[model samples]
Target chain A: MTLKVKGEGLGAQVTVDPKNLDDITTDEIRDIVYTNKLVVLKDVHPSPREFIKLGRIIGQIVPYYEPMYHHEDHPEIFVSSTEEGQGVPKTGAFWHIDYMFMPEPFAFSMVLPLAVPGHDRGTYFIDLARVWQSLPAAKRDPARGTVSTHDPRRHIKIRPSDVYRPIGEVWDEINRTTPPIKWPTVIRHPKTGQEILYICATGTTKIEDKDGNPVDPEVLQELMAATGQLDPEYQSPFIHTQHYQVGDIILWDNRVLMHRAKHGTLTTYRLTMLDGLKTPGYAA
Target chain B: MTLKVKGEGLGAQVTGVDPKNLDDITTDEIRDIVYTNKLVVLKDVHPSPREFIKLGRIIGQIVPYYEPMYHHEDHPEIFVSSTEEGQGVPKTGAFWHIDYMFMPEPFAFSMVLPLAVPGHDRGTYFIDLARVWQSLPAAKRDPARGTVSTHDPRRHIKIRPSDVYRPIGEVWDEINRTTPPIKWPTVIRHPKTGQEILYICATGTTKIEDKDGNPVDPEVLQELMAATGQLDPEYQSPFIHTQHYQVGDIILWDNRVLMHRAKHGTLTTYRLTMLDGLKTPGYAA
Candidate 1:
């Protein structure tokens, strides 16, 4: 019943299985969850009621992830049976954190895969905590800050400038371009004391040096390339990271882990929950 | 090719297709776009060279439809294409008006639909001008003067709430449920002389009502419903409204027309230019 996991390093070190932890008291599980930046539930399967309770606990700690979608009412919970035509959809393919498109992104991410594939389908984790510590003093530039830009009105047909492309095309263009690496040196976790990696990749376009002008794209690309090579072992897709099966739940610190989708084709039947913690009267 | 027709009363009475009088402008083909609006191709398609000259004549006078999607390289050319799933996408079902959601909704919408569908697919017109004129007497009470509550942060996961949801939700819920009748006399159009619609729907959920303590739900609903009903006929959907096809064509109109998305589906492939004639730009403040 005791699911507390004390850890220091990174990778698929923790696991949560609903079946074994059914008897564990909600208070104990919450205490364990609150202490750690990341917790993985191995071999855990609780009834829908218990699952909802567990979601409520997480929701209390993380107020941002609200309105958790259930299979019935919540639109978020409906596992897209099939995307009309484009084969099966790919789940969680990048190492980026959550909601960087907004001014203040969410602090953490809770990913519970309904069914994890056998090979690289496991939720890959790159402990940015260790990565930051290992950086050479010179490489850690304090002056560098993050810069991001997005045109919210691009979806509208009429616009001041002719930059209104379809949502898909805009995403493609932004992803192709390398993001500038100017971010807070220490992104303190909202609850836990864990200082994790906070630089953005998708929405970020260029880095603003102290002068405010964008840093040279070539230089930014090289810098990212070098930083990325430091942890080549962590670069593999989620599938290759571990052996995954159905009902296996994986949780990682958005600040610490740079997760990505696997490259190989996969079935769309897999179900995952990006829990938006919404529980009324809990200590949000 | 020219299409010209006179727009005097409300609905379009077709005159001609590419008529010879005004550079062969078709004046006969008029489509009953909306309950309050109409569409009349006033002039024929001039040569691209002449089109530019004609555009210059109408530049300050007529605003082009705002085009949001263009290649990074072709950003300068005000022109756009209507290819489906290409540069432009067909958008007919959307209920939003030109720049309505932005901080400053434009005052007018002026552009042409070059490549239209068969008569069934032609875009319907929204004549807010007439709808406003009719509703002016009733719209005086609900002016939608205050700022709209921010979107629920929970729904918009990234946006941090500057304020709490309970109060904001309460206000919006009240507004949504409350009736528009019996409280403030709804003003449909500019009382003096202009062609603008001055109802709560035009301004969105208005906070400032002429009376106090918020109007009752049923009454508010009744007034707003009546105002909106004035333009029910003009609700043209992409499936049934667009009558013909003309790529790179322009549709022009004044702000008086209360146009919106017709109740039909549209192909995501067609690309078209959309411009706005509003005072403010960008996200609604």
Candidate 2:
């Protein structure tokens, strides 16, 4: 099957027929994903089994946090749905990088909507790599070679009702499984070697010193001030707000882009994560 | 006269009082709180256009009309804005500025009533120019000891219906004839506050001049803009917001000590702003 590619700044959409998924090369797909950071496969619909297979071809398919939402047969695909009149879920409404609390936050995510509320809804994406490039040296020098702390508790607090079971039981289990983790403030993309501002407004708690203690409050305030102002400049050029259609599949590189769902509701959606990549500088 | 003032870091609101009977709080009392905090939200009173105009008189003489169409028919001092009429105004004042800087003496105070706002989206943001001035290094603040030139770009540019058509040369001549670039002091003592703020913004400022009245170098001007731009977030943690303004809320501020802009949000919102000023004849040493 022939594929056509259209370009945006660090993002692209590829037209393909999913019936011919077997014909696609993993290497070609990996090249496009890393170079663009966000790849959209237009006008394709694949079965759940086929979707799982597609994720496996790119990388390991990880189970989501609430296992009950996992597709009964596949266990890899997580289903999300919204009622017609209910307000949009509060989770993921704010700007954030996904899964940063984990030691190895997944490298990529795939999302497809089965039903959408209306024409006026989509996710907003900011090119963090561009944000890192735009900073003056005074701001960049201090963040270089530094680490940041992340906690999943921050995520749970926003949407307490969606955790699947007795809130206390689930919270305890998640705490044990996913404690606060540390990651470099800046990361070099493994495939492209591009630098990314690997921090988020929500997930990132503090900047750390070499001894693993939090940085001085005054110093941290300065750093936060520097990073906080970059968002407006980063978004000034163009924030890619991708409006979804029924048969479109979007694959995004989590390392280089941050996203938030605009105020809207979707009736049905599914996501799968491609995992198993080590944190930057952690590979043996 | 007595007043109860509650404080936030960058702003304050006076409660347990009637705004119509502001005589309960003397002009000196109001002046001291606003001068110190840069902003004040007067709570728990609704005033008529006449009453609002009376409050304006206590501060300064009311400007009859900034634009004739929006002013009240019976009482021309109060201006009303609504979404239904399509005033054709742009969404909001989305940049940091004090009002009417294009004039020789800008408006010293402004008060607004939010007749309607749907949600938490559109908030008026204020940056303490006094705090910004205090934070700047001596060299940076000292250069602003001179005057700066200002012009309203909207007056210079050609927008139809609002501004009549004319030849390029004719329009430039009209612009020169009408505006004739106004010069204001880079630093001025707040009439009430007594604090000096380094005042320049993307809004109306064109050129920065030294004490001898010569234009500073282009590179120096660019560096000054960059340094001044950082103050938004430098003081942003304590930035003030009247997040959810109800119908009865009256927000008043001294334009001299604070720089403010309205946040952009929903299409349908209505507000009425009352403006007045005390003229500044020349620079202060």
Candidate 3:
């Protein structure tokens, strides 16, 4: 079968026969994902079971942190819906990376839209590796040796409407369970070996350089401001806005891509995988 | 609840306390019972997928069936065997064979919980391999230990698939690297019980080679096949025991000592579990 992969990296689109999914090897799946930071698998419909298996073939399924979004029988496949009482952890319409608070963040993320709300309301991803490379030494050097702590609770006060609890109690629960994870500000992709600007627009709580000294607050604000300028909303070349259609699968390399949800009426099956991965060094 | 245990060895039955909510003491007792008795029947216990997996983790490291066609859609860890509709060429396990014997290392143990049993005729027949080896003539027994047997799934290819719309060769390639002809001793002792067992299967044992790696005589091979109540041309071994199923019946057996075959019957469906990468599980770790 002719496997057609058009474009490259964030702009790539792969066309494969869904019927012959069995014939596709896991190595082939990994090549497309690692090579192309963001890829849209066009015209294929995999059931919830098949979706989980697809993730299984490539990597280990990292179950969602909370039970709220878990698909009934399959916890690996999270049913995306944020109807008030659902406690879907409204990801909000902003730029961020998934599970940066977890020590071993998911290496990959896949989404198969169940209901498409018919607009520019699909997910967005920024190829941070490309963004890092595009920045002049003057713009990138200052943040190279820095490390940052990302804490979800401090960034978003998400609470279940059905559960009557004080925001303070929810925050306390989040802190106890997840705490925070430290990552280098500028980290290299574990597989591609490309340097990436790891800090996101949200979730990052603090930044410190090589020997544990905080960068000036004003410099942190400027570094934060720089990431927003490269958002897909501004038609940045490094960004890929994946608009969805029912039955198609979209997978991106989370190691090199900073993604954001385009909250809409659309529902999807979201699967995060940690085949195996990491980041760090250069500064050390 | 009062925990009740009964019967002896193969005919053993355990009651009271759901396996899902097993405490440390209950877990050890269950393991001890399973090893002491080659098989144990847990009556009237139906657990959710999570509970089922939790029980599996306690017993052994959970491994999914290599075939994707049989994967339980909701729970990949469970293998679904539903024999319904037209039985489009699907009579497997009728011959005397150890489960997973074709692999480099046979599965340590297997658990089958019958979800549907339409007729009484649907049951499994087993022969203790240790007993078969003991009854073997002195010359054959020593020769069997010195020789090695090679096996493949070639004979059982017709089964093992649900809707694989492709050639068996192509399907085999997709199941990771290769199931290509693996070799194991013709007679080997169980790691747990130290009871010697005849390890060849009619559907899988392709060839037998001597200690020098020379192929053994075909006549010698046929004699070994006939000895284990091999069912190709009707097995007449008197050591056969068939276990029929009822509702909420769970059976766990030591694959090392027992080789099983499914009996022909009306439609039957069940979830089968096998733990890979381990020695015989029904023994002290």
Indicate the worst ten consecutive residues by lDDT in candidate 1 chain A.
A275-284
Instruction: State which candidate has the highest lDDT.
Output: 3
Query: Looking at candidate 2, what is the lDDT of residue B155?
Result: 46
What range of 10 consecutive residues in model 2 chain A has the weakest lDDT sum?
A: A275-284
Candidate 1 lDDT over residue span B1-285, tens digit each:
333343322223333432123333321212122112333333344324334334423333333333234321243333333335544333433443432222223333344444434434555435342333332332332343222221111221111133356576755554344322122223333221223343333223333333345544445534543445433445431111232333333344443344344333232212222233333221211
**Cα error, candidate 3, residue A278 (Å):** 2.3
Per-residue accuracy of model 3 over A203-240 as CA lDDT, tens digit each: 77677765445676665667666655334455666666
Q: Cα lDDT for residue B225, model 3?
A: 75
How do all models score by TM-score? 0.40, 0.45, 0.47
Q: Can you tell me which runs of candidate 3 are displaced by over 4 Å?
A: A17-21, A82-92, A155-162, A229-237, A279-284, B1-285
Ranking by TM-score: 3, 2, 1
Winner by lDDT between candidate 2 and candidate 1: 2
lDDT of 1 by residue, A1-284 (tens): 55546473333344444443455664565445445535656655544444545555444222221112124433223231123332224434554554333222333454444544455555554555555555565654542343323222222122223266676764443322211222343354444545554443443344444323445566444444544523445652221253444444445445445555544323322122222321000111
What lDDT does candidate 3 reach at residue B168?
70
Model 3 Cα shift for residue A204 (angstroms): 1.6
How many pairs of residues collide in each model?
A: 122, 0, 0
User: What DockQ, on C-alphas, does every prediction get?
Assistant: 0.01, 0.01, 0.00
How does chain A of candidate 2 score by TM-score against the true chain A? 0.83
Alpha carbon lDDT of each predicted model? 0.37, 0.61, 0.67
Clashes of 1: 122
